Nucleic acid binder design. Structure first.
Lengths: 156, 88, 122, 80, 129, 205, 85, 100, 82
RNA sequence: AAAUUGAAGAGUUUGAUCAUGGCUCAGAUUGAACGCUGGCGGCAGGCCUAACACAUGCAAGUCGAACGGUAACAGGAAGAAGCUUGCUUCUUUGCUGACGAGUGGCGGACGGGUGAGUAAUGUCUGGGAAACUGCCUGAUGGAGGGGGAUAACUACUGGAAACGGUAGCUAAUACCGCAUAACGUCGCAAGACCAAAGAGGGGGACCUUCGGGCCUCUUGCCAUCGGAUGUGCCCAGAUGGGAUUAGCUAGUAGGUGGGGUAACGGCUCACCUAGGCGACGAUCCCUAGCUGGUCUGAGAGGAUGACCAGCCACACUGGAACUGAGACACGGUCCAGACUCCUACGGGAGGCAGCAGUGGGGAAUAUUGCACAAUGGGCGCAAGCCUGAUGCAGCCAUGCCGCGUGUAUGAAGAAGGCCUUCGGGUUGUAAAGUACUUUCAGCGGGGAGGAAGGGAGUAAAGUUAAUACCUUUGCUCAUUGACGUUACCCGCAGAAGAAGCACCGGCUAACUCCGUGCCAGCAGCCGCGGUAAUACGGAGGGUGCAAGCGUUAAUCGGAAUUACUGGGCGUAAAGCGCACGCAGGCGGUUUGUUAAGUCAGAUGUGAAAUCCCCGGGCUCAACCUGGGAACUGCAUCUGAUACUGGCAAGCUUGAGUCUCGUAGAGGGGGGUAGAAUGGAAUACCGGUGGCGAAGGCGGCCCCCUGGACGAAGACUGACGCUCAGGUGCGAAAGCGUGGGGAGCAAACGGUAGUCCACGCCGUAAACGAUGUCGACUUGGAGGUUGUGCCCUUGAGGCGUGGCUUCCGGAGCUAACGCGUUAAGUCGACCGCCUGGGGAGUACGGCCGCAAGGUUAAAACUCAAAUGAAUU
C-alpha cells in the first residue's frame, strides 16, 4: 500500500588518517497514492542499511498534500536554497511529465498528469525537498472558503 | 549665518504679509544677500574647496525655486526679477 | 536592469562562432595535402597519430587526420575532409573520409565498413 | 469630421512656414513600457500667425514644397 | 519618496501579516479606501475605518485563520515603472480562480469576476490570494 | 517492411505470448518462453524506466506488427484528437483492416490475414482493398471474394477462431462469410496488460 | 535585329521620328514667335500671333503629338501674359 | 559686535606702567562704542612656567564688549610694545560677570 | 481588359480549376481580384463539381468584363440543368 | 459544436559537499553532400557556388474581310497540238483558291529569368489629392468634300560582304489640306479654335457608261461624359550592425516670378532671406532584395526568405533619348569601353541572370524529348498560326507516403558454427520436409477519364424587300489525345526475380569468446589500451531502424547561457572615488475640467495561399479540395472616466524658510608657546570616541561660515528624488615653474620627495569588497549628544530625537554570515557582468610637455578556472 522507490545513491566518503572510509547515502520517498506522502534521507554503511534507514525515516512525518480528483489544485512554485520548482496541473491522460528526480516524488504521490519544470541545479535532495515544499503549501477550494468565511459555490 | 536685523529687514521688505519668512519671495532675497556676503570672503586665497559645497547648494536651491516660480505662478516671478537684477 | 536601461540599449545578444571555420559553412570541402607525417599525442596518450597538413580550395591551410590502419596518402594526393574535433591533438578539427575519389579504404575489415569505405565482401 | 492633428510649435524662422512637433504616446512592443515619441512636421503657414511655444491644430493637404505638405487651420492656447 | 502609496499600503499589510499584528495604521486615500473595500468584501479582513479629518488614516483589522496568515500572496503588478493594461478576455486568473485581482475600471474599482461578467477589462492593481 | 525473421524469439524477448502463431498447440510446447532469447538468457537485469518504456513500445508494436514510422504517425494522430491519448491510439491501432479481419477470425495469425488481404481477397462494401493499413469505418460491411473461399486455411482459421474467444464490439457472421465493424472498441475491451501512459511519456520526451 | 518585326519597327520609328521632328520644330517656331511678340510689349501684334498660333498647336495636340494638357497649359500661360497688358 | 576676554601679563620691572595702559585702552573703548561692565586687577601672581623671564607677572582683566576692530588693534599695538610678556583673548562665551 | 478565366490547381493527371476574374495581361496562376467558384473536371457521380455565383458574374459582366469560352459553356450547362 | 491539449534531463572542476559558472550529449528540420547497400509504386523537389564566358538548336508573330499585287503551289478557262475527236502534252489569262517579299494595323512594355546593386527613392500596414489609362463595356452625335508624295517594282550602279545610291512608276483604314462644331480647350464673360475611313456579305424594284448606284445587316472610324482595370504621386508608422563613425548640409531650407511634367513640388532657372536636420542617433562605414510565409519553441521569442504568390531592381559595363496609351525598352536604337568572331585589311556582327546544352568553379543538382490534345496569351470576322507559357514524358532513394521479399505445419530440438563446468546450452520453427497462396514485376487480352468544343446539313426566332445574308436557340452526322503498350479488370505459371546499415563500458537498448599487449588503435563527454582489454581488430549472439542506414554541415530546443514574461552585482563577474546640476525617468493629498493614453462597442480593412478543426475526392495515406476562424494588426465613429496624461483652483504631513541656543580634530590665511636634532611632527587630553558627499580631519587666538543637532513658536505652498554626458572636489604616486630642504629615506651620509604658491596626474582593498532616496518590521547590552513632567526630594524615575558599538528573534543567506545603520519586506532612478588565459593587451581615438589616463578587441589556447566549509 505504501509505495516507495529509491531515487539516487551517492558514494559519500569522509577521510580518516588512514584512508577513505567509503560510505553510501540514499534517498527514498513513500506515499499511498493519495494526499499522504513522506520522504526520508539515508546514510549508512551499505545500500540496504541506507534504504531501510531512509524508509523508517519516511514511515513517519506523513505530509498531507491537498489534491484534486486526480491532479494538483493549481500551479505552484517552490524553492529550497538550491533550485526552483514549477508545476502545472495538466489534463487527463497526458502522462506524468517530469524530469529525473521529480518523476519519482510525483509518481509516488498518486498524481498521473502534472506539467512540471525545474529551473536551477539538479541536486536530488534539494529538488525533492523543494517539490515537497511546493506540494505542502497548496490549498483546496473548501479550505479557502472556510478561511474567507465563504462557500465553495461563492468562489467556484 | 546672518544677523537677525538683516533677515528681519529682508522679510519685511519682501514679505507680502507679516512674518512670512518662508515665502519664496523673501527666501530668494535672503539667499542672494548671503551669497553676495560670502562672495567677499570667497574672493580671498581661492583655496576653500570645502565651503564651495554650500555655495553650489544654495545656487541650485535658488534655481529650483525659480523653476517652481515659472512652473506654477509666473506673475510674481516676472514682478521680482527687476527688484534684485537677476538673470545677469 | 531597469526597463529604462533596456529602452536606451536593447539586450546585447551574443553569438557563438563555429569551431570549424575552414569549411566555410559546408559539410566537406576538397583539399590537397602538403606534408605527411606523424606526431605523438599528449599525456595520458601514447601513439603516433597519422596527421597531415592539407591545402584547401578557398586558400586555407589546416591539419587533417586519418583513422583506421595503414594508408597510401602521399604528397599531392587530393582528399576530402568533413571535420570533427579530437582532444588528444592540439587544435585539429578535420578528419579525412576514407574512400573519396583518391583515398583507398582500409583493408581486412568486416565491421563498420561505411565509416572507412570498405566494399561488401563475397 | 475632418481628421486633424494637434501639437506644439518649435520654430518659425522661415516665413510662411513653421516646424510643428507632435508627441505620440506609444507602448513599447518588446518591453511593454509606455514611452513618448516626438515627431516633427513642416507646416505651410500664412502671415506668420504663430510663434514659438504655441499649440496649433493642423490638417494634411497636397504637397506645397520639397518637405512640406501640411497646413494649419486653427490655433489653441495662443499664449506663449 | 512614497511615489507608490498603494505599494506602501501593500507592503505594510505584508509586514503586519508576518508580524502577527491585529490592527495596522497607515495614511489613507480614496484609492486605498477602494482597495480596502474590494479586499474586505472578498473575505481577508474584518472591517476598515478611515479615522481622521485633516490627516485621515486607515484602520486595517487583519483577519486570522487559526492564527495563520489569511492573505499571504499580495504583490504589485502595475508599478510606476510601467503600467500594465489588459483587455476583457485577456484578464488573468490567479490560482486558477482561488486568487483575486484588483482592477481599475470605468465603472469604478471592482472584482475581476464582476468585470468579466460585465464584459470589460482595465488596469490591474494587485494580485490577492 | 514486415519483420521476416525468427518470430517466436520476439515473444521470448517480450517474456509473454503475443498470439503470434496459429494456436493449435500451447506456446511453451515449442519454446522456453520464460527463458530469454539468445546465448545470455540467464540474466534479468533491472529494466529502467526508459527501459520498461521502450519494452512496452516494442511490445505493442510487435503485437500489432507496425514499424516505427507508421506507429509514430499514429501517435501523432492520436494526440491530435480530443481528450485521452492512449485510448485513441489503441482504437486507431485496432482499426487496421488486417487486424479487423484477424479479430473476425478469417485468419489464424496476423501474418496470414495480411497475406490474405494483400492478395486481393477482402472486400469492403463490395470493393476490393489491397492496403493492409486501411482503417475501417464504423458500421461498414466487409466480405470475402468467392475466388478465395475454396482455400482450406480459411476454414481452418474459421474453426480456430470458433475455438477462440468471441469479441463483443465486432459483429461477425460465420456462415455468411462476412462481418460488420459494429462500433469503435472500448478501453475495457482491450487486454488490460497493455500499459499506455508509458507510451504517452516515451514519445513526448 | 534578330526579328523581322524589329526591323520593320525600327524603320517605322525612324519615319515617325522624322515626321514628328519636322512638325514639332514648326510648332516650336510658332511658339517662339508669339513669345518674342509678348516679350516685345505690344498688345495687338502679340494678340494676333497668339490667335494665329492657337489652331496649329490645337491640331497638333489633337493628332496625338502632344497631350491636351500641354496645349491647355500653353494657352493659359499665353492668355495670362496677354491679359497682363 | 562681539565680546572678548582679553588678559595679558607684563614684566615685573614695568608693573608701574599698567595704570596708564588700562586708562588708554578704556578711553579708546569708550570712544569706539564699547561697554565695560567688569574690570579686574589681580595684582602680581605666579605663572605655570617662567615664560621669558623669572616666575613673576601681573594679572589684569578687561572683559570688554568693544567691536572686533578696536580690540584687534590691541594686539597690533602690543607688537611694538615689548613690556608685556604674553597675552590671551577669548570670545564672548556668554560674557562673564563679577570675578568672584 | 479584365476577363473571367480558369486557373489550374491540382496534380499530375488530376486537374481541378478555380474560375476567377483578373486582368487579361496577367499569368494563369497570377494575381486576381476576386473568386467566383470552382470547376471539377474529374468529379465522380453526383458531386459538387460546378459551383458559381451568378450574381457576381452578372455584376462583373455589367462592368463590361469579357468572358471566356469554358466558363460560358459551364454557365450554359448550369442554367440548362436547373 | 469543434479553431486545440502545454514545458523531462544526464554527464563533466573536489580525496569527499554545495553553489556559480563554461563545455558535451540526448530532439526536430534541411534545396543537403559523402560512405555502404538498393524491389516497386504514388506525390513533390532538384547550379545555394563564378550577375563567370558561352559552340549549337529553338524561345514573337499574326492579319488578303486594309492595301497594291503574283515569286513559288494547285484549279479554272482560251487556243497549239502529236488524232486517241476529248482525252496525255505546250503558250496565255490574278481568272479562282492561296500566298513569298513589301506598305499598313496590332502584337515586341505580356508571359519568362536572376537577386549584382539597392538600409530608403525600396517593402508592409493605414490614409490622401494634384493625374493618365490602347485593348473592355454603357450614354450622347458625326461619319462631307479634296490634294501630293512613296514602298515593293523597272533600269543603271557603289561596296569583299553587310549595307546602300541614282533616275521613272503605282495603292489605301499611310500622309496633308478645306468644310465641319458641341455638353470640349482657352478666357470673368463676350468671343476663337479643334477630327475622321471605309471594308464584307448578299439582294426585291429600278439603275447603269457594266464597273455600279440603291436596300439591308455585320464590322470599322472620330468627339465628349462615364464605369472598370492598371500605372504615376504624397504622407504617417514600422522596416540590420558599428558613436573604435559628432556634427552634416548652399539648390542646401523657405518665399517671389518664368519654364516643364499626364499631374503638385528646387523638378529647373533668376532674385530675396539664412536657414534645415541632428543624442528620440543626422552623416559616414560595413552588410541585405522585401512581404504572405518556413523551421524550431509550451508561450514569448530565435534563425531564415529554398518552391508557390504579391511588390521592387537588372539584362556584357557606363550614359542618352526616339517610337509608342504605357519603356528610359531582355531577344529595339544611338554614343563611349572591353571581349569574341568575320573580313578581300577599307570595314562589319553579337550579347543564354529564356528553354536545353558546352567550358570553368565546386562536393554538389538533370534531357541539345514530345504536343499545342487541354487552360491561358497574341493576331484574325471566323477558320486558322505561334507559344521551351504551359500539359506530360527522361535521370537522381533528394524529400514525404504506400505495398512486396512468403503463410501454416514442422523436433529426427537436423547438420554445421559458437560457447561450455566438457554434462550440455545457443543458433533454433529458425533450417530441411509437408500443405497453401501469386500481391508486385514478367507474359497476353479487354479497358474509363481528362473532350468541352469546332465543322456539314436542317427546324424556330430575331432582320429586311426577302421565306436571302447574318446572330442566337434546338436537332441530326463524322469526328478533335503527346500523355498512352494509359489508371484499372481478367487468364498464364511457378516460392518464384526481389535486404542492408549502425550499435553492444556508463550517458542509452543490447555480451560472450579469440588476437593485441599504453604498440597498433578507438572515441559526441568521462576517457580505455603497461600479457583475463565486456571500450581496439576478428567470430557468434543480441539490440534499434528499414529501401534505407550512418557520418558530416547548418538553424532552434535543453540554453533561466541576455533572465520583459524568466538572472544578478558583501566573500565567485559586477555599486562608478565622491557631490551639484542640464536632458531624460518618476512623483504627496482634495476638488473641478478635458478625454490623449486606457477600456467597451460598431464600421472598414488585414489578398489568395499556409496552419486548425469539421467533411469530401484519389482502392488508404501522402496529395487535392468545400465551410468557417485565425490572420493576435491598423484606421474612422459612439460611449465610459477608476487610473495616468493636459489644465484651473486648492491643502500641509514631503520639501524647505525664520528665531533661540548647542557641541563642534570642518577648511583656508594672519600671529603665539615649548621638547628633540634653521626646518619639521605638535607627544601626555585621545576614546570600535567627534566633524565632514569624500578621500581625510588633532599645541593656543581673528574672519567667513558651511553642515548637523534640540526647542516650541511664525511662514511658502508639492516648490521633490535620482541623474547618461557636463562641471567641480579629489588618498596616494609622478612631475613643471621659483625656493630651500634640521632628521628622514627609491636611486646614488644621502636625490628629488614630504612643505611654501601657481598648475597639472586622476590613481588605491578610494572597502563597510555594501550607489542614492524613501515606507514598514522580536529584543537585549553600551558610548554619545539632547530637553522636559513631577518632589533636583545628592549624578533623581519615565519617555523622547538623533550619531554610534556588539550578541541576536522572524527573515534572508550556496555556507560564512547580515539582521531597525538588513545583505528582511517594497518602491523610484542610475551605473556594471555573461568561462579562464590571451589582456584592461594591440589597434586606434581623446586628454595631457611627457610619464601616462579613458574607451577598448579579435586571432589563438584550455576544459576547466572560481568561492565557503569541514573531514
Amino acid at each position: 500500500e505504501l509505495q516507495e522507490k529509491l531515487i539516487a545513491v551517492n558514494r559519500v566518503s569522509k577521510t580518516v588518517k588512514g584512508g577513505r572510509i567509503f560510505s553510501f547515502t540514499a534517498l527514498t520517498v513513500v506515499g499511498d497514492g493519495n494526499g499522504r506522502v513522506g520522504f526520508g534521507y539515508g546514510k549508512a554503511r551499505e545500500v540496504p542499511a541506507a534504504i531501510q534507514k531512509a524508509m523508517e525515516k519516511a514511515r513517519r512525518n506523513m505530509i498531507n498534500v491537498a489534491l484534486n480528483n486526480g491532479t494538483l489544485q493549481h500551479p505552484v512554485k517552490g524553492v529550497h536554497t538550491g533550485s526552483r520548482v514549477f508545476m502545472q496541473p495538466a489534463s487527463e491522460g497526458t502522462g506524468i511529465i517530469a524530469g529525473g528526480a521529480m518523476r519519482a516524488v510525483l509518481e509516488v504521490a498518486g498524481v498521473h498528469n502534472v506539467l512540471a519544470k525545474a529551473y536551477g541545479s539538479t541536486n536530488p535532495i534539494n529538488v525533492v525537498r523543494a517539490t515537497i515544499d511546493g506540494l505542502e503549501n497548496m490549498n483546496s477550494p473548501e479550505m479557502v472558503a472556510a478561511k474567507r468565511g465563504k462557500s465553495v459555490e461563492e468562489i467556484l | 549665518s546672518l544677523s537677525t536685523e538683516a533677515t528681519a529687514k529682508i522679510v519685511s521688505e519682501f514679505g507680502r504679509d507679516a512674518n512670512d519668512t518662508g515665502s519664496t519671495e523673501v527666501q530668494v532675497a535672503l539667499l542672494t544677500a548671503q551669497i553676495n556676503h560670502l562672495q567677499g570672503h570667497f574672493a580671498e586665497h581661492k583655496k576653500d574647496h570645502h565651503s564651495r559645497r554650500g555655495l553650489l547648494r544654495m545656487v541650485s536651491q535658488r534655481r529650483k525655486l525659480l523653476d517652481y516660480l515659472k512652473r506654477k505662478d509666473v506673475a510674481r516671478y516676472t514682478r521680482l526679477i527687476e527688484r534684485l537684477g537677476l538673470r545677469r | 536592469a531597469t526597463v529604462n536601461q533596456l529602452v536606451r540599449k536593447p539586450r546585447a545578444r551574443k553569438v557563438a562562432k563555429s569551431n570549424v571555420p575552414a569549411l566555410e559553412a559546408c559539410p566537406q570541402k576538397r583539399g590537397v595535402c602538403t606534408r605527411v607525417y606523424t606526431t605523438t599525442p599528449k599525456k595520458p596518450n601514447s601513439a603516433l597519430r597519422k596527421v597531415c597538413r592539407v591545402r584547401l580550395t578557398n586558400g586555407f591551410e589546416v591539419t587533417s587526420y586519418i583513422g583506421g590502419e595503414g594508408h597510401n596518402l602521399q604528397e599531392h594526393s587530393v582528399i576530402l575532409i568533413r571535420g570533427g574535433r579530437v582532444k588528444d591533438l592540439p587544435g585539429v578539427r578535420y578528419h579525412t573520409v576514407r574512400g573519396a575519389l583518391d583515398c583507398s579504404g582500409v583493408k581486412d575489415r568486416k565491421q563498420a565498413r561505411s565509416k572507412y569505405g570498405v566494399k561488401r565482401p563475397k | 469630421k475632418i481628421r486633424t492633428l494637434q501639437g506644439r510649435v518649435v520654430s518659425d524662422k522661415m516665413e510662411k512656414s513653421i516646424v510643428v512637433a507632435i508627441e505620440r504616446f506609444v507602448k513599447h512592443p518588446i518591453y511593454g513600457k509606455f514611452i513618448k515619441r516626438t515627431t516633427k512636421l513642416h507646416v505651410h503657414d500664412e502671415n506668420n500667425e504663430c510663434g514659438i511655444g504655441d499649440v496649433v491644430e493642423i490638417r494634411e493637404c497636397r504637397p506645397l514644397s520639397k518637405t512640406k505638405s501640411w497646413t494649419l487651420v486653427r490655433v489653441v492656447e495662443k499664449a506663449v | 519618496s512614497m511615489q507608490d502609496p498603494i505599494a506602501d499600503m501593500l507592503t505594510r499589510i505584508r509586514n503586519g501579516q508576518a508580524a502577527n499584528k491585529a490592527a495596522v495604521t497607515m495614511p489613507s486615500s480614496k484609492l486605498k479606501v477602494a482597495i480596502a473595500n474590494v479586499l474586505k468584501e472578498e473575505g481577508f479582513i474584518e472591517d476598515f475605518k478611515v479615522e481622521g479629518d485633516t490627516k485621515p488614516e486607515l484602520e486595517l483589522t487583519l483577519k486570522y485563520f487559526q492564527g495563520k496568515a489569511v492573505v499571504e500572496s499580495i504583490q504589485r503588478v502595475s508599478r510606476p515603472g510601467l503600467r500594465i493594461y489588459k483587455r476583457k478576455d485577456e484578464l488573468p486568473k490567479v490560482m486558477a480562480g482561488l486568487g483575486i485581482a484588483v482592477v481599475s475600471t470605468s465603472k469604478g474599482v471592482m472584482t475581476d469576476r464582476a468585470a468579466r461578467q460585465a464584459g470589460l477589462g482595465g488596469e490591474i492593481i494587485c494580485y490577492v490570494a | 517492411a514486415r519483420y521476416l525473421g525468427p518470430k517466436l524469439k520476439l515473444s521470448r524477448r517480450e517474456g509473454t505470448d503475443l498470439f503470434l502463431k496459429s494456436g493449435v498447440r500451447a506456446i511453451d510446447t515449442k519454446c522456453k518462453i520464460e527463458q530469454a532469447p539468445g546465448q545470455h538468457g540467464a540474466r534479468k537485469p533491472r529494466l529502467s524506466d526508459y527501459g520498461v518504456q521502450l519494452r512496452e513500445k516494442q511490445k505493442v508494436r510487435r503485437i500489432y506488427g507496425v514499424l516505427e514510422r507508421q506507429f509514430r504517425n499514429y501517435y501523432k494522430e492520436a494526440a491530435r484528437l480530443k481528450g485521452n491519448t492512449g485510448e485513441n491510439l489503441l482504437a486507431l491501432l485496432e482499426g487496421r483492416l488486417d487486424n479487423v479481419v484477424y479479430r473476425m477470425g478469417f485468419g489464424a495469425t496476423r501474418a496470414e490475414a495480411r497475406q490474405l488481404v494483400s492478395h486481393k481477397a477482402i472486400m469492403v462494401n463490395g470493393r476490393v482493398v489491397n492496403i493492409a493499413s486501411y482503417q475501417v469505418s464504423p458500421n461498414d460491411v466487409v466480405s470475402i471474394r468467392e475466388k478465395a473461399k475454396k482455400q482450406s486455411r480459411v476454414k481452418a482459421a474459421l474453426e480456430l477462431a470458433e475455438q477462440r474467444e468471441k469479441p463483443t464490439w465486432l459483429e461477425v457472421d460465420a456462415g455468411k462469410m462476412e462481418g460488420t465493424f459494429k462500433r469503435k472498441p472500448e478501453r475495457s475491451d482491450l487486454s488490460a496488460d497493455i500499459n499506455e501512459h508509458l507510451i504517452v511519456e516515451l514519445y513526448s520526451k | 535585329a534578330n526579328i523581322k518585326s524589329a526591323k520593320k519597327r525600327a524603320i517605322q520609328s525612324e519615319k515617325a521620328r522624322k515626321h514628328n521632328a519636322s512638325r514639332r520644330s514648326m510648332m516650336r517656331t510658332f511658339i517662339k514667335k508669339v513669345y518674342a511678340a509678348i516679350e516685345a510689349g505690344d498688345k495687338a501684334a502679340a494678340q494676333k500671333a497668339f490667335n494665329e498660333m492657337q489652331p496649329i498647336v490645337d491640331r497638333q495636340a489633337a493628332k496625338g503629338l502632344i497631350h491636351k494638357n500641354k496645349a491647355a497649359r500653353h494657352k493659359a500661360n499665353l492668355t495670362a501674359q496677354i491679359n497682363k497688358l | 559686535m562681539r565680546h572678548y576676554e582679553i588678559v595679558f601679563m607684563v614684566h615685573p620691572d614695568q608693573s608701574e606702567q599698567v595704570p596708564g595702559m588700562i586708562e588708554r585702552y578704556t578711553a579708546a573703548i569708550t570712544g569706539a562704542e564699547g561697554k565695560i561692565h567688569r574690570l579686574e586687577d589681580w595684582g602680581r601672581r605666579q605663572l605655570a612656567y617662567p615664560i621669558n623671564k623669572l616666575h613673576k607677572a601681573h594679572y589684569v582683566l578687561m572683559n570688554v564688549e568693544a567691536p572686533q576692530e578696536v580690540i584687534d588693534e590691541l594686539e597690533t599695538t602690543f607688537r611694538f610694545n615689548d613690556a608685556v610678556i604674553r597675552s590671551m583673548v577669548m570670545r564672548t562665551k556668554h560674557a562673564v560677570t563679577e570675578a568672584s | 481588359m479584365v476577363t473571367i478565366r480558369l486557373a489550374r490547381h491540382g496534380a499530375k493527371k488530376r486537374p481541378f480549376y478555380q474560375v476567377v476574374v483578373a486582368d487579361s495581361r496577367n499569368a494563369r496562376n497570377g494575381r486576381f481580384i476576386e473568386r467566383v467558384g470552382f470547376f471539377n473536371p474529374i468529379a465522380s457521380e453526383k458531386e459538387e463539381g460546378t459551383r458559381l455565383d451568378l450574381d457576381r458574374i452578372a455584376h462583373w459582366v455589367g462592368q463590361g468584363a469579357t468572358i471566356s469560352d469554358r466558363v460560358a459553356a459551364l454557365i450554359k450547362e448550369v442554367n440548362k440543368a436547373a
